[PDB]
Amino acid sequence: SENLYFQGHIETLPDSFTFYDGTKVQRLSDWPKRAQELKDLYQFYMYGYKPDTSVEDVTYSVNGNTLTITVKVGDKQASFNATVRLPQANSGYQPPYPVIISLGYLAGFNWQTWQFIDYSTNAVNRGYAVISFMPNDVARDDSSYTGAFYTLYPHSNKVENDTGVLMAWAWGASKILDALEKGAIPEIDAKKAIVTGFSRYGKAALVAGAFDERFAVVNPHASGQGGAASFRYSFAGKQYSWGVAGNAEAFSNLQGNTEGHWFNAVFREFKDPRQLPFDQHELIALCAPRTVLITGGYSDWGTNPEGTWVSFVGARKVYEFLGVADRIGFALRDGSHAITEEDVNNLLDFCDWQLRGIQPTKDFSTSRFAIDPAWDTISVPTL
């Protein structure tokens, strides 16, 4: 069954270039209106709503390596800590520096010793500041709906209050950027901010990049289903040259008691992902015209490697339409579900290119996957 002439399969991928009312996106000036529709769809049907930022008062305090972020909403206020690491002069770069805001530590896990491997060193040595926070401080990874976000915005089932945990974590990243824009760390350039996260935090990194236009680089790492991976296209059992694909995460697993708190109540009622009014090529395209880098592993089957490619190819159509196709990149590598040194180095190479003009040695526009006419069904509008 390796003859691909007889392996094709067609899903309907909701068209990025069709407005909610059925008319077509034709001009560059049409895109902002279409993007707002997609943001409204994703908030109502999947993640819940980002709160109005205009009525949040953000203050900060710096003590050694700790940046304390404090936010006040009405008569309530809540704080959480972020850890700051800056480059030295010997990096060959002077302040202010671009900054990687990491949801979780920028660090890998050694399965032999169960010790962590700090990759924030790689970043500061290449002239990137690193600010990390612990996402559970902002919202716990469960259905208690507690943490700094929910102190300020108590959860309920009313549409305006039914905000899921991934949107809460993304809000955490945005609050650090708020403090940086207010000059909390003068050595950091808030206009060169990069958001990154692994696995569950990679889903939230993508949400942060789609809903907060100030991030210059968005890096969902191994984000999988509910992140960059297509809901409608998965390839369990397909024979690749590096192996037979395992199962991608099941839609119902996203909705159940171990993960459903990531999303809202509407999302948890769907019977089938084909009922969603979008697929994830649209969430990625919400980052345009800012830059996005999809990283992960070719053998990380639960995150749906080729379905992530499907979403990337479809999202890139919007980037092409806007005239900035170079700003979306793809970089899977060998192996499985992990933060590896190569993942971090690929991010830093992508940032040096997009932010500093340094030409990369990697081709960020291709992969091991072919482009399959069966799923390559989003097309750029004619001029």
Author numbering: 12 to 394
From the publication, what sentences describe this entry?
The hyperthermophilic bacterium Caldicellulosiruptor kristjansonii encodes an unusual enzyme, CkXyn10C-GE15A, which incorporates two catalytic domains, a xylanase and a glucuronoyl esterase, and five carbohydrate-binding modules (CBMs) from families 9 and 22. C. kristjansonii has been shown to grow on a variety of polysaccharides, including cellulose, xylan, starch, and pectin, with an optimal growth temperature of 78 °C. From the N-terminus, CkXyn10C-GE15A consists of two CBM22 domains (CBM22.1 and CBM22.2), a GH10 endo-xylanase (Xyn10C), three CBM9 domains (CBM9.1, CBM9.2, and CBM9.3), a GE from CE15 (GE15A), a cadherin domain, and two surface layer homology (SLH) domains believed to anchor the protein to the Gram-positive cell wall. Collectively, the results show that all five CBMs have their own distinct binding preferences and appear to complement each other and the catalytic domains in targeting complex cell wall polysaccharides. We have determined the structures of the third CBM9 domain (CBM9.3) and the glucuronoyl esterase (GE15A) by X-ray crystallography.
In addition to determining the structure of CBM9.3, we were also able through renewed efforts to crystallize and determine the structure of the previously biochemically characterized GE15 domain of CkXyn10C-GE15A.15 Residue numbers in this section reflect the numbering as in the PDB file, where Glu22 corresponds to Glu1340 in the full-length protein sequence. We were also able to determine the 3D structure of the GE domain, which represents the first structure of a GE from a hyperthermophilic organism. As expected from previously determined structures of CE15 enzymes, the overall structure is an α/β-hydrolase fold with the active site located in a shallow pocket, and as in other studied bacterial GEs, there are no disulfide bonds. Within the active site, the catalytic serine-histidine-glutamate/aspartate triad is conserved and easily identifiable in CkGE15A and is comprised of Ser210, His348, and Asp311. Compared to previously studied GEs, one of the major differences in CkGE15A is that it lacks two inserts previously found in bacterial enzymes (Reg1 and Reg3) and has a rather different structure of the aromatic-rich Reg2, implicated in the interaction with the lignin portion of the substrate. In the structure of TtCE15A from T. turnerae, rather than a loop, Reg2 is found as a helical protrusion with several aromatic residues that could provide binding sites for complex biomass.22 In CkGE15A, Reg2 is uniquely formed by a β-hairpin, which presents several aromatic residues toward the active site (Phe120, Trp122, Trp125, and Phe127), thus possibly playing a role in substrate recognition and binding moieties such as hydrophobic lignin fragments or a xylan chain. A similarly positioned residue within the loop is not present in CkGE15A due to a sharp turn at Gly115; however, it is possible that Tyr212 could play a similar role, as it is in the same spatial area.
